[PDB]
Every structure is written in structure tokens, then in C-alpha cells.
Design an enzyme around this catalytic site. Structure first.
Site, PDB file in Angstrom:
ATOM      1  N   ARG A  36       1.222  -0.740  -0.256  1.00 42.09           N
ATOM      2  CA  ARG A  36      -0.119  -0.209   0.062  1.00 42.09           C
ATOM      3  C   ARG A  36       0.523   1.326   0.220  1.00 42.09           C
ATOM      4  NH1 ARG A  36      -5.129  -3.074   2.599  1.00 42.09           N
ATOM      5  NH2 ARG A  36      -6.133  -1.491   3.045  1.00 42.09           N
ATOM      6  N   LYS A 199     -17.220 -16.960   5.416  1.00 38.27           N
ATOM      7  CA  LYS A 199     -18.430 -16.965   5.674  1.00 38.27           C
ATOM      8  C   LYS A 199     -19.303 -16.422   3.819  1.00 38.27           C
ATOM      9  CE  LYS A 199     -18.089 -15.502  10.608  1.00 38.27           C
ATOM     10  NZ  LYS A 199     -19.005 -14.157  11.614  1.00 38.27           N
ATOM     11  N   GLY A 352      -7.245  -8.494   1.232  1.00 36.59           N
ATOM     12  CA  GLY A 352      -6.317  -8.470   2.116  1.00 36.59           C
ATOM     13  C   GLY A 352      -5.694 -10.198   2.069  1.00 36.59           C
ATOM     14  N   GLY A 375     -12.668  -4.191   1.862  1.00 38.72           N
ATOM     15  CA  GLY A 375     -14.193  -4.111   1.667  1.00 38.72           C
ATOM     16  C   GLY A 375     -14.821  -3.557   0.466  1.00 38.72           C
TER      17      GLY A 375
END
Ligand SMILES: [K+]
Ligand SMILES: [K+]
Length: 394
Positions: A36, A199, A352, A375
Site C-alpha cells: 500500500r 463466510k 487482503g 471492503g
């Protein structure tokens, strides 16, 4: 529609760049992945090359309150080596030290403010915070796609203090937007979504919006077991979101009605516990032993998936195939990285965890694009308007 840095006269001005320096750190606070920081450099260098002074701001983690643990000081050290330029750090965000340093800042200098989220107003889109951040500079640049999905002061309220000739999107933000948006627009086909992680609720809305767009969908990771369970499979002790069984069934039903080819694991690496140090078996998905759990896709699934993606011209991949932090349960993710990267698709990675798999696989350089905004890319893929992007719309 989005205002670009390229259409803003910023030569010789003082410029606030909202960057995404939310890098991972180890227990001694050393940076363990600086990607980043590296991705931020082209916008920063473009301003410095145009004679600007530069005030950088980012968050790091989610501090509940102020402590050295969440200091940006290691980010400043790392960025200084990567830019081969010196950095002044502020001891605070909008207190006296930041304001004075900002005012003293000379052409060609770089000021890194302390963690934005040391200010409680940042994650509330506080207008006084925004006003104080804006007072330090003449031009606002957002280069932090990673927080653009949230109404936070440094990406949303701050933009109300600049007109359209004094705010814009940096080069990284524009790339993140272009790559994500293409996928929900007219991607080259066959278009394969590869989705993973543990999930279903994590991905449900992305899946719902992608379904009418993709040609094929592979579902792996722990989330697959809710889909297999929704189909009546015994899944032993594997992860299950009981409450999403019906939604998972709806994805598969609509997927089929729309002609999407949907693939689930047909075998798994099964073990009695999620650890390196217990036994493991390659089993069919219909035969996870009683009390055991599925922790990675098996070799038959790897091979099937390879064949599924082989003619792809576009692939979006978000989520590991298995518990890849444990070596024994990492091979399915690693091989998928290999197959996706070595093929000829435009390949776009999200998440990530997925960037981490791709790094460990040694394939980062063969992917078309790896999003460094967790997200945010997902919420774009979901069809949402991101407040940070909207804020920069002409
Ligand atoms: K100002
Ligand atoms: K490639």
C-alpha cells in the site's frame, strides 16, 4: 465524471493527499507488507514533481484511543526509504504540532500527519475535523479507495471545503475504480468469478449482483460448506452459517436459471482440527468423516477448477480456497493463484487475505490488478455508490 488529479492545477501548491497506509504489522510493529505504501507513490511523486508541498494522511488499524502502537512513525520510515525522500511527522492530527508543521512546510517537503483515527470524529464524518484538515492545504487529493466506502471525514466531509478546481482523485483511486467497475460493466468473456473465504454473509451481496453478469462461478473456502449443506451434503464439523442456508440455495437456483455454471468443491482436505499438527485426509465432499472438518479444497477440485477457468478472459478472485495461514491447508489457494496468474485472463484480485495468498504464491506480478482496498472493492462490485467517490463526482 470523477474529477481527476490531472485536471487540477496544483503546481507549487500545498496538497493534502489522503493515502491508504493501513499496512499490516507484526508484534514488534515492523511492517510486514508495504504494498500500500508503494501503491501510493505515483500520486505523491506527481505532486512533488510539480513543485508542491505535500501533507499526507492515513489511518492505521482501528485504535480505540491514542497509543504508540498505532503510530504512523514506521509508515513514515518505510515511505522515506521507498521515495528516497525525507519525511516530517506530526505528533498529532489537527493539534498545534500538525498545524505549525503544515504552515512551515516548504516546497518539496512531505508531512505525514499522525493516525487520522486518533481523532474520534474521523469515522463519524465530523465536520469540524474536516474543516481543520482542510485549513492546512489548498488542494485535496483522495488516493485511498480503501476507505471510500465509508463516510469518514478525510474522504467525505473534507471535500465540502474545496471546490471542483481544488479536489480530485489520485492515480491509485482511479485505477481501483476502473478495474472494479469494468467487472460490473462489460468484461471480456468468459467471465469467471472465483469466490472464497469462510463466510457466506461476507459475499452474499456481491454474488447477488455478479450472478447476472458472470459466465461461471467457483465457490471455495469455508463458505462453500453452507452451499454444500444447502444441497443436503453432510459437512461434518466444517464451518456453517445455518441462517444463510436458504440464501445459498437461492444463489444456486437463480444461478442455474440464468445459465451460470456454478462449481463447488467435490473433494476437500479434511482434518480433526484446524492445525498443522494433526492428521489430514483427501476425501470426497460427500465423505468428510464424523467430527472432522474440511479445511481446503482437494486435488480433484483443484483440477476441476483449473479446467473451469482455462478459457476465461476475465477472472475476479476474492477469497482463499481454504485456511491458507496453515501450510497444510494452503495448497488449493496457492495452486489457484498459479492457475489464475499463468492463464491469459484479465485477473483482478480482491481482499487482503487473497492478496496475501497471491504474495505467498509468488504470483503478485502476473495478476492484472490486486486491489489494496479490502471492503471497498466488494461494495463497488455489490453495486453500491461509494461516498468517497461520490464526493469527487463533477
Ligand atoms: K483550505
Ligand atoms: K496473466
Amino acid at each position: 465524471d470523477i474529477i481527476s488529479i490531472k485536471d487540477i492545477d496544483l503546481a507549487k501548491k500545498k496538497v493534502f493527499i489522503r493515502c491508504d497506509f493501513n499496512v499490516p504489522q507484526d508484534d514488534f510493529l515492523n511492517i510486514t507488507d508495504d504494498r500500500r505504501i508503494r501503491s501510493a507513490i505515483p500520486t505523491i511523486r506527481y505532486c512533488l514533481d510539480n513543485g508542491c508541498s505535500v501533507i499526507l494522511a492515513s489511518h492505521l488499524g482501528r485504535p480505540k484511543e491514542i497509543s504508540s502502537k498505532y503510530s504512523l512513525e514506521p509508515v513514515a520510515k518505510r515511505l522515506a526509504r521507498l521515495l528516497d525522500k525525507e519525511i516530517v511527522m506530526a505528533k498529532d492530527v489537527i493539534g498545534e504540532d500538525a498545524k505549525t508543521k503544515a504552515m512551515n512546510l516548504k516546497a518539496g517537503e512531505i508531512l505525514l500527519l499522525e493516525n487520522l483515527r486518533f481523532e474520534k470524529g474521523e469515522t463519524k464524518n465530523d465536520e469540524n475535523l474536516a474543516k481543520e484538515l482542510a485549513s492546512m492545504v489548498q488542494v485535496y487529493i483522495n488516493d485511498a479507495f480503501g476507505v471510500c466506502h465509508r463516510a469518514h471525514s478525510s474522504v467525505e466531509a473534507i471535500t465540502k471545503f474545496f471546490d471542483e478546481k481544488h479536489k480530485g482523485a489520485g492515480f491509485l483511486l482511479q485505477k481501483e475504480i476502473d478495474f472494479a467497475s469494468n467487472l460490473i460493466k462489460h468484461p471480456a468473456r468468459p467471465f469467471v468469478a472465483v469466490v472464497g473465504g469462510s463466510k457466506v454473509s461476507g459475499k452474499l451481496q456481491a454474488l447477488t449482483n455478479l450472478l447476472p453478469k458472470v459466465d461461471k462461478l467457483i465457490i471455495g473456502g469455508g463458505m462453500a460448506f453452507t452451499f454444500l449443506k444447502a444441497l443436503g451434503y453432510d459437512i461434518g464439523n466444517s464451518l456453517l452459517e445455518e441462517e444463510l442456508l436458504e440464501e445459498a440455495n437461492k444463489i444456486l437456483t437463480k444461478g442455474k436459471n440464468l445459465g451460470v455454471k456454478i462449481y463447488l468443491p467435490v473433494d476437500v482436505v479434511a482434518a480433526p482440527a484446524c492445525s498443522q499438527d494433526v492428521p489430514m485426509k483427501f476425501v470426497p465432499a460427500q465423505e468428510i468423516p464424523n467430527g472432522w472438518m474440511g479445511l481446503d479444497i482437494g486435488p480433484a477440485s483443484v483440477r476441476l477448477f483449473k479446467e473451469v477457468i482455462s478459457d476465461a478472459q476475465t477472472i475476479w478472485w476474492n477469497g482463499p480456497m481454504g485456511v491458507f495461514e496453515i501450510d497444510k491447508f494452503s495448497k488449493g489457494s496457492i495452486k489457484m493463484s498459479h492457475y489464475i496468474s499463468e492463464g491469459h485472463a484479465t485477473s483482478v484480485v480482491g481482499g487482503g487475505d487473497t492478496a496475501d495468498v497471491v504474495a505467498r504464491a509468488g504470483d503478485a506480478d502476473e495478476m492484472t490488478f490486486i486491489s489494496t482496498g479490502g471492503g471497498a472493492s466488494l461494495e463497488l462490485i455489490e453495486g453500491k455508490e461509494l461516498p468517497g467517490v461520490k464526493a469527487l463526482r463533477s
